[PDB]
């Protein structure tokens, strides 16, 4: 691409992944702050990691304001550098930063609505993220949140085929993955966004499981244990057990008590057991919860 390491001045470390390390850097000719993701291909006896092949190929097509911008790839034999636009913070670190203050309803609402736009755009370009969690959502000082970390993402066909089952960080994982379903679709990213909506309101994770079955049992204790009525086919599902405790569904008002009627409607549709009945990111944009949406700047210094 049209980039070279000599024009970047490193600033500090800002992150780390299996790939390697993420650095804030500065372009010495343009002034542009970037994030530099380094991939080590030297430790790679199997060539370019499949995670990186997917991340680059997919991020190259996904030009959208609520998806992080891959500006460039510097491609030597020993190393691969991913040049990304620089955003100051993740949503996880900001929720912790709002621990005692609370996150303001207008920011919760502008964040959910921009997350729903970037998801809708990923889904409209045959891409599933499969790791939507606050840690992978990047905010800036102007009021934007963007989807990032596309290393677990996948280009899908229509209808879907069977893909990797080891998918989505546990607390954000959808039941159909937990229940070993042959097929999963765009509804898994919505499940994750619904968990995130709740987390923005409470600043705590909605389903904090220590195991797959604890995750399942915590979802079932909050939302009730699904039967053939609410979710046709559930009892036939591979990892469904007849012995599973049959918890009643509590009033959804008690799942996230400070949520208003509109918030609750939308959280309910994002957390519907049946992936077929679960709301699309496209449809969710028209939800009454967003009639008064604005894009405020974040209320804390980042």
């Amino acid at each position: 691409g049209p980039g070279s390491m000599e024009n970047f001045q490193k600033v500090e470390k800002i992150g780390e992944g299996t790939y390697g390390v993420v650095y804030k850097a500065r372009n010495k000719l343009t002034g542009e702050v970037v994030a530099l993701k380094k991939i080590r291909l030297d430790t790679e006896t199997e060539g370019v990691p499949s995670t990186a092949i997917r991340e680059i190929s997919l991020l190259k097509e996904l030009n959208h304001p609520n998806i992080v911008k891959l500006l460039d790839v510097i491609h030597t034999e020993n190393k691969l550098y991913l040049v990304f636009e620089f955003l100051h913070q993740d949503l996880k670190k900001f929720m912790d930063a709002s621990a005692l203050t609370g996150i303001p309803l207008p920011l919760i609402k502008s964040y959910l609505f921009q997350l729903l736009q970037g998801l809708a755009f990923c889904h409209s370009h045959r891409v599933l993220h499969r790791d939507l969690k606050p840690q992978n959502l990047l905010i800036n000082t102007e009021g934007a949140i963007k989807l990032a970390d596309f290393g677990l993402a996948r280009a899908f066909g229509v209808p879907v085929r069977t893909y990797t089952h080891e998918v989505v960080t546990l607390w954000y994982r959808a039941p159909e993955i937990l229940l070993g379903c042959k097929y999963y679709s765009t509804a898994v990213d919505i499940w994750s966004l619904g968990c995130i909506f709740a987390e923005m309101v409470t600043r705590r994770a909605l389903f904090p499981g220590d195991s797959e079955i604890d995750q399942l049992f915590r979802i079932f204790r909050t939302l009730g244990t699904p039967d053939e009525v609410v979710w046709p086919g559930v009892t036939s599902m591979p990892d469904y057990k007849p012995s599973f405790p049959k918890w009643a569904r509590q009033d959804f008002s008690k799942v996230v008590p400070p949520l208003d009627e509109d918030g609750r409607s939308l959280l309910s549709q994002m957390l519907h057991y049946d992936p077929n009945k679960r709301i699309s990111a496209k449809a969710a944009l028209a939800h009454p919860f967003f009639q008064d949406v604005t894009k405020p700047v974040p209320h804390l210094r980042l």
Partner: protein
Amino acid sequence: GVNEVPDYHEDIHTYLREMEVKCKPKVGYMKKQPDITNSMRAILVDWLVEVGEEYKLQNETLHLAVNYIDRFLSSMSVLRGKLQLVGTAAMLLASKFEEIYPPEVAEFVYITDDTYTKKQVLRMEHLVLKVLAFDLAAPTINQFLTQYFLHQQPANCKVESLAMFLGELSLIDADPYLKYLPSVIAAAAFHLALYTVTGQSWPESLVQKTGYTLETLKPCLLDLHQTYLRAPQHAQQSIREKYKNSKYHGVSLLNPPETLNV
């Protein structure tokens, strides 16, 4: 339901339609290839079909790899002793993109009979990614076929498998199929598969979705009809061997129709 992404299927189809044009190889690249021929490419692709059967890889992976190869050969002049290195690197990249469990790099070295070293494979891997600028999410014939398959009333597994098979036959012959886009070959393959098994024809639902009609499809259909008729005698035979399997409903044993009433 959601497995057929009802809220996104049209946006997706429109998007692939745009991307298939961007991912298209040069129709006339072999004339500019001084050392390799259509006959050699057919040998490579037929080998890749056998390799996909050996490692039990998806058909999608085969299609991707062929796309990568043709796009690569559209800009990079290649000696015949290296054509299999390009092909191996294409199938490795395709595998890492599309497969849950890609074969290991050592497995790709092994299938080449130690013609090449692991170091040669990994370096071509890098070269292909550089030549293709990491654009690997290319529309395939399959991505079109699976959407078209939703317009069957009702679904017929013989029709699905035969269209898959006909589309695969097209990968073998750069002449003429380099001249047709994945969406068009898929349409031809589907209509030809539907007639052979049910006697039915390209549906209006798909005219509505695609804008394509049997008149717009006539050129590829005539070419595909001939390929189907001539397939038992083609020098490459690996796709017919593959489509005898029960996985594919033994569709390679179905008789092609003598005429198309076009």
